[PDB]
Structures are given as structure tokens and as C-alpha cells.
């Protein structure tokens, strides 16, 4: 006797013999969970690192454009009085008027006001930006990036997939891709992914090395569907998850010598363990229900909206946290610069 | 909590503002609204946060680079509020289908 | 858009209409037809187009 996760092929049994069916095939794929995650610096997001550049050199030019203006046509300014901005407090009002706070602006002249009502509308649009493309990204946080079957596997944007070389499992999506008659765009564009180098990209040599790929990284393996839910079953930490399908043309069994006569004891005894349920007791016994996790679920559907993760508004707070640091040594030099002299 | 934690942090910037008034006060005389009190210093940093505040008085270049985190700060914060009250007004209105 | 289709055209009453659309169906049936199509529309191209 040969005892395993055997399945029907005809095949073999012109060199061994079968048992007949007592349970339906199934193909099936394992995932790694996605529930809510915690990005640190999603508060960043909306804008890149060289438009948050440009923006900030942005500042500092308009501050220089402004200040020479105090150079090439100054109006009749006030006596002895810094309305004759420095370039420093020019700079500092370019900066506290950006951000929508500050107060009244001293110029006179039209050139500077032209200027600055050119500014004023950069900036609220700047701003009304930030917020929009904010409040877009979080709206589009949503859950159907659960991937629920295997339309949405070969319609999926995220994820790569594939199985072990050589398995009935590949050659099966073979036989639905490669075959001039089959033309269905689902199984054609799991082919593809699974036929993309000639199958050396993306396959595995064992299904427990494609199962580790999956734990500790980024991918999909395709087996039989009874093995995974299994695995599924007994994942320790609830990252995988599992999906299926049921499909034709296969049975799960067991094989016997070439010519075995003990191949007639199955059929009734079969229908008996079944009728009995005995059959569906063995089943419950090695599939239970309530393993360490559900098998199935992989999101969060009641957290429609929910609330700011405290690490996730982390990022915020390392802006603060920075400007306090960077302030300690200035708040030293306040004091350490006079102490080079004494002066005062 | 996280309520919690920005009164926590409001309170924090005033005392860390008062410390800094307090080492290294300006030329100006001592002893007047030319000098600074701590319940004015939580009174700015509040006023300021709500977009309310209007004017700042501080010159010390430690202080406004500080300050300048901290407007930031507050317009990170209320652009975090209204764009998660709008999505959660937006999730709402298409998820509730016992029909 | 179909049931229009591409075919040799002959002189009217030109006996071997028939000869070639008897072989056109042996071409079709082994496959042959489209191992010769793929020889120009290779399925599995370089690129998903």
C-alpha cells in the first residue's frame, strides 16, 4: 500500500491500482493576512520629497525677490524705522505668511504687493492640495485589496504568484492556457503569470519552500486546496489565509499494487462511513472548525472609518521632537557665542 | 488617548517655550509685557494652534525655529481632522444594506 | 464582428474550389492551421499587450 495525499489520475493506473473517490478535489491558494495596517508616515505622504524641496527653496527665493525690491524702489518709509524690512524679517514674513498664520504686511509699494498677492494664492492652493490629496488617499484605504477568488488573483495589482514546476497543479493552468479551443482570459492570465520565463520567475521547487515564501515575504502559492486550509488551520501566528475553488475531474484516494483485488472493499463501505456520517466525523476530526484562526477572514470590516493609530501619527510628533533638538543647540550658542568675548 | 496626547503636547510646547523665554531673555527691559509670563506663554501656544492667535511677540531665533515646528505642526494636525472626518462621512452613506 | 472571413478567391467554375476546401478542413481539424498561425501570433509574446 502507498499512502498519501493521493489523488485520481488515470494515468497510473495502468501501473497501480485506485481507490475510488470519497472526496471531492479542490484547488486553493494561501496568503499572507492584510488587516489595518500602521504606516508611521502617512501624515507625509501626499507630497514627494522633491516637491516638499521645491517648495521649501521656493520660500527662501521669494524671500530674496522680495527684499531687493526694498533696494530698487523704496517708497518714502518711515525714519530711522525697520519698515525698511532686513532681509532676515523678510524672509520671516515669507515664512509666517505661508503657513496661514501672521498678521498685517508693511508694504506700500505696488511691485510688493503685486508680489505677495501672488504668493498668498500659491500658497492656499498649496494647502487646499495637501488637504484634498489627504482626505483622497484616506478614502481610498479600502478593503478590496482582500483578494476573495481567483478573478480577483489574476486581477490583483499587488501580489506575485505561482506554484511548483512541474506539478499537475501547472499543467493543469497549461492545459487551460496553452489549448487553442480554451481562450478564457482568467485561466490565459494565470498561465501567463505562471509561464512568464519559461515558468523559471516566479515557480518553487517544494510547496514548503513556496509556503516560507509566502510567511516571510510577498507572494501567493497555488496547491491543493485540502492542504492549505490545513496549513491555514494550524498557522501559530494568523498571518496566512486561504481561498478556493471546486473543481472537476479529481478525487482524493489512496493506491494499491499493480492488480490489488482489496480495490473492491471501497465502493460500499464508502457509501456506509458517508451515509453515517463516520465518513464526515474522520473529516471533522482532521479539519475541525475552531482552529487557531479563521481560515477565511483576512480584514477588518467594522473599523469602517476608525480612529488615528497613536504610532501612526508618530511621524507627526518626530517634527516636533526635531525642531525641540535643533533648538537645544541654538539655545546653547545663545549663551556659548557671547562667552567667546563676553560681550554683551 | 491621542486626544490625550496633542493636550499633553500643547501643554509641553508652553513650558518648553517659558523655559526658553526664561534662560535667554532679550535685551528689552525685564519686568514688563517686554518680558515674558507663563500663562501667556500656554495662551499663544493655544491661540496659535486654533488658527486664532494672531500676532507672536518672541525674537529669539531658538524660540521661532520652535514656533516654526509648531505651526506646522498645527496645520498637519487640523488637515488630519478634517480629512478623516471626511472619509468617515464618505465610508458612511454606502456601507448599510439589510435589505 | 464575425462570420466574415479571409479566403482564396477563383475564377468562377474553377475546379479546384473544391480540391483546396477539402484540404483547408484536414488543416483546420489537426491543428496544424494554428501551429502555422503561431508561427506568426505567438501567443505568449514578450510583452502583455
Redesign the interface.
Known sequence: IGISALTITPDRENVVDFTTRYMDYSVGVLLRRAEKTVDMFA?LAPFDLSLWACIAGTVLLVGLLVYLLNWLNPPRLQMGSMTSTTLYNSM?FV?GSF?????EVPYTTLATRMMMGAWWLFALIV?SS??AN??A???I?RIESSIQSLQDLSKQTEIPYGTVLDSAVYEHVRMKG?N?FERDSMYSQMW?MI?RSNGSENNVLESQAGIQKVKYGNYAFVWDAAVLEYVAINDPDCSFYTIGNTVADRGYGIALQHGSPYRDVFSQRILELQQNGDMDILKHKWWPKNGQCDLYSSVDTKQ??G??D?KS?AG??C??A???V???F??ML??WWNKRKGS?
Open positions: 501624515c520671516w515664512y503657513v496661514q498664520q501672521g498678521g494647502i495637501y488637504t489627504l482626505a488617499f484616506l478614502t484605504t496553452l487553442p501567463r509561464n469602517k472609518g480612529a488615528l497613536i501619527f507627526v510628533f517634527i516636533l526635531a525642531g525641540i535643533l533648538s537645544c541654538i539655545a545663545e549663551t554683551r
